[PDB]
């Protein structure tokens, strides 16, 4: 039972399939977890948006959508729409560090999507654009 | 070898690669530089998609040309290579063999620093 956490790059010849599809054709789920909102967009391998759900789209409010429960609910909401179009496995790509980071990931499983991998694509500039000034002067 | 050019040519056919290498070496010789050796490192996948000459390049052939050139003809060759549409990213550096390897002595045991504070009783 030799299992490697490294992704199955297309350059290799490994035989790993999910529901008969290769790792390259499995749809993607971009989860942008900001400090005040969490958005989820499930797209196909061909970069075609299938489902979209955010904490604000569920009837929440300003400070209500910033909690983890809002992200957990948005995960189920996105998973229902993804399953409505015939999606069983998805690759999660997380963007940003927020309170609803793991909440959306587990909400996807609660809503009925099997996560095969978690990708952390957080934008970290190499000292590029200057961010805003610090608070509490 | 004095200077080393790490030429990254566009992935093309054998005759086109040969013609591009021939003209690049002729340009190097025209500047007053004698060529020591040319080594082909093989056609590999680029680490990142390099965009050059209004073209997105995903592959490329790697070549290494070592030579002796005057210090004034480096930028001229760089300028000539910059306008060549068959070159992805040219770079001329000093040859590593020029710098003689220094004696790597190893880790020297550095003692903890003392006498940093006075001997007053706390």
């Amino acid at each position: 039972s030799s299992f490697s956490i490294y992704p199955p790059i297309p350059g290799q010849e490994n035989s790993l399939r999910w529901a008969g599809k290769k790792f390259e054709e499995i749809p993607i789920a971009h989860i942008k977890a900001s400090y005040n909102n969490t958005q989820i967009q499930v797209v196909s391998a061909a970069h075609q948006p299938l489902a979209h759900a955010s904490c604000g789209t569920e009837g929440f409010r300003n400070a209500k959508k910033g909690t983890g429960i809002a992200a957990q609910t948005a995960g189920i909401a996105a998973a229902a729409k993804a399953t409505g179009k015939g999606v069983t496995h998805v690759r999660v790509v997380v963007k940003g560090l927020g309170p609803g980071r793991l909440s959306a990931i587990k909400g996807l499983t609660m809503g009925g999507l099997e996560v095969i991998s978690i990708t952390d694509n957080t934008p970290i500039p190499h000292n590029g654009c200057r961010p805003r000034k610090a608070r509490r002067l | 070898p004095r200077y080393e050019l790490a030429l990254i040519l566009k992935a093309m056919q054998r005759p086109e690669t040969a013609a591009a290498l021939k003209r690049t070496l002729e340009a190097l010789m025209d500047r007053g530089a004698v060529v020591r050796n040319l080594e082909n490192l093989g056609e590999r996948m680029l680490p990142y998609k390099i965009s050059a000459h209004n073209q997105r390049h995903s592959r490329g052939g790697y070549f290494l040309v070592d030579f002796y050139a005057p210090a004034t003809t480096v930028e001229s060759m760089m300028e000539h290579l910059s306008r060549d549409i068959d070159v992805i990213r040219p770079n001329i550096v000093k040859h590593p063999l020029t710098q003689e390897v220094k004696e790597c002595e190893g880790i020297v045991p550095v003692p903890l620093e003392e006498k940093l504070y006075s001997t007053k009783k706390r």
């Binding site: 983890g68 429960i69 957990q72 609910t73 587990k106 609660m110 | 550095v110 903890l112 620093e113 940093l116 504070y117 706390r122």
Partner: protein
Amino acid sequence: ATPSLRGRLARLGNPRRPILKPNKPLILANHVGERRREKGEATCITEMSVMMACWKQN
């Protein structure tokens, strides 16, 4: 291993610009710090959500 301390502090014998500016003197005390108590958090939030899911639909 322990980071180097030579040539770090501002001393008369040190010729260069000091690297470290300690808030308090680097003297190893005879007592370690007390263990900090972990901050509590709300629990059973995910289960309360699915409990209220019944009510919202029923």
